[PDB]
Amino acid sequence: MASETFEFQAEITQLMSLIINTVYSNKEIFLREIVSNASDALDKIRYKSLSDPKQLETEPDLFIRITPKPEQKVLEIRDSGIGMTKAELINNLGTIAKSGTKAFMEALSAGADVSMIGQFGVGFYSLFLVADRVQVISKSNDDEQYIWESNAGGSFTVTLDEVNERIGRGTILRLFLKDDQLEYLEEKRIKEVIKRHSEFVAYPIQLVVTKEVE
Amino acid sequence: MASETFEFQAEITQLMSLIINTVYSNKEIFLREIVSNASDALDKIRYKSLSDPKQLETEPDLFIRITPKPEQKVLEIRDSGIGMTKAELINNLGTIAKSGTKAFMEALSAGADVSMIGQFGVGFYSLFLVADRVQVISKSNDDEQYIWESNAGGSFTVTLDEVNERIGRGTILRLFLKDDQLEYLEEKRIKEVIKRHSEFVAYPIQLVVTKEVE
Ligand SMILES: C[C@@H]1C[C@H]2O[C@@H]2/C=C\C=C\C(=O)Cc2c(Cl)c(O)cc(O)c2C(=O)O1
Ligand SMILES: C[C@@H]1C[C@H]2O[C@@H]2/C=C\C=C\C(=O)Cc2c(Cl)c(O)cc(O)c2C(=O)O1
């Protein structure tokens, strides 16, 4: 099952650099950006559902779900939103321009808080504060399940998904956390970051916790 | 990705019948049978590891993990034991004879408690007390990941797994619970059944719980 490799738009590889290179504070901010994107994706599928209700049937429950995977140093955030086809993954997550990119970098470099990233429409790339690699696993009603992957170098891959659990519909962000950032695998840390920045999220935010029976 | 279909040995389709037809009590007993098989499978990989340590490397953590999936009316029990190749799934779970089968049925039908099922070496089939369908997803170090599936009819299928999460090594039992048996999706119910019957399990028994942040 062969990967296809794509080059990032120039200003995205630029934006990526850094965000990872010039940040410093309010990085736990990566999580509000994630949840915000997930909420918007769920907004999209519910809106679409008003005129096309059967779009919901692939996954009738509307949720955002966070699953720490401490063994793998991974944090997953799943939504049952609209999902992205192969072409949408390629276009949304790296090959097309985003209007707000260069303006966010030129901004940042004059003291903008990075919380501002979302106002420019490039909030996805804030995950590189805590992660040195990401896979975005997505399933749209209009396509098969695919995996987009990036380690913040100049290329990304997209591969037909024959390896991950089936998502009925929606997207999983799979963050591979930096060795110094393992705190975001912690139940208390996660709830603390969520209550602060995602109060008026309209969807259930589920946390998956593993407990030894003893 | 095509399924292969196999016929069950006669006395297994017989044993299946019923267990599901003549049971009545101590059915929560299905869980001790599961955990017992999982413990034995973990016993096997650790024993094998003494002379072949690198067998462990595909999944270094030794655990039993129970994951309720209430949306799907599913209960999963995962172990990181030795796992089963395609041929082992076909042989272990339905095509070869098991020495203790007929003796367990002839026994049962004179008032044996069904807790006895394990002493005859056929404890796997106790899952049909609570489940009307099962998939066994398995990954041995010696083969690809495969899915065995049965709904207690006379045939089962085995399919190369291109749909479920990767298990490094081991087996997941995926139980599709009967509509009247949804209690076994409940955190309290599960811990209660585990403490009673699996005290001297030597491995961590992990319970995966989903909690809304609120
Ligand atoms: C295109 C769809 C629907 C859009 O409404 C969402 C708003 C912003 C999305 C930005 C993205 O780049 C894709 C995306 C990300 Cl990054 C995410 O973390 C979660 C998601 O569910 C989606 C998605 O599926 O986005
Ligand atoms: C053959 C291997 C190793 C054997 O030591 C285990 C003892 C009994 C197994 C009975 C089976 O039929 C397979 C099996 C079941 Cl049913 C299970 O619920 C969990 C498991 O991990 C295995 C397994 O992988 O079994």
Curated annotation (Swiss-Prot), chains A, B:
Q: Which organism is it from?
A: Saccharomyces cerevisiae (strain ATCC 204508 / S288c)
- What is this protein's function per UniProt? Molecular chaperone that promotes the maturation, structural maintenance and proper regulation of specific target proteins involved in cell cycle control and signal transduction. Undergoes a functional cycle that is linked to its ATPase activity. The nucleotide-free form of the dimer is found in an open conformation in which the N-termini are not dimerized and the complex is ready for client protein binding.
The outcome of changing residue 107 to N is:
Induces a 6-fold increase in ATPase activity
Q: Which gene encodes it?
A: HSP82
So where does ATP get bound? 33, 37, 79, 84, 92, 98-100, 119-124, 171
Query: Subunit composition?
Result: Homodimer. Interacts with the co-chaperones AHA1, CDC37, CNS1, CPR6, CPR7, HCH1, SBA1, SSE1 and STI1. CNS1, CPR6, CPR7 and STI1. Interacts directly with the substrates GCN2, HAP1 and STE11.
Family membership, please give it: Belongs to the heat shock protein 90 family.
Describe the effect of residue 97 to I.
Abolishes interaction with SBA1
User: What does the annotation give as the result of altering residue 41 to V?
Assistant: Causes a 98% reduction in ATPase activity and a reduced client protein activation activity, leading to growth defect at high temperatures
**Compartments, record wording:** Cytoplasm
Comment, domains: The TPR repeat-binding motif mediates interaction with TPR repeat-containing proteins like the co-chaperones AHA1, CDC37, CNS1, CPR6, CPR7, HCH1, SBA1, SSE1 and STI1. CNS1, CPR6, CPR7 and STI1.
Outcome of substituting residue 101 to I? Causes a 90% reduction in ATPase activity and a reduced client protein activation activity, leading to growth defect at high temperatures
Highest rank taxon of the organism: Eukaryota
* Phenotype upon changing residue 83 to D: Abolishes ATPase activity
Note from the entry: Present with 444943 molecules/cell in log phase SD medium.
Q: Describe what upregulates or represses it.
A: Expressed constitutively and induced by high temperatures dependent on transcription factor HSF1. According to PubMed:2674684, it is constitutively expressed at low levels, however, due to the specificity of the antibody, this result is unsure.
Name-wise, this protein is ATP-dependent molecular chaperone HSP82
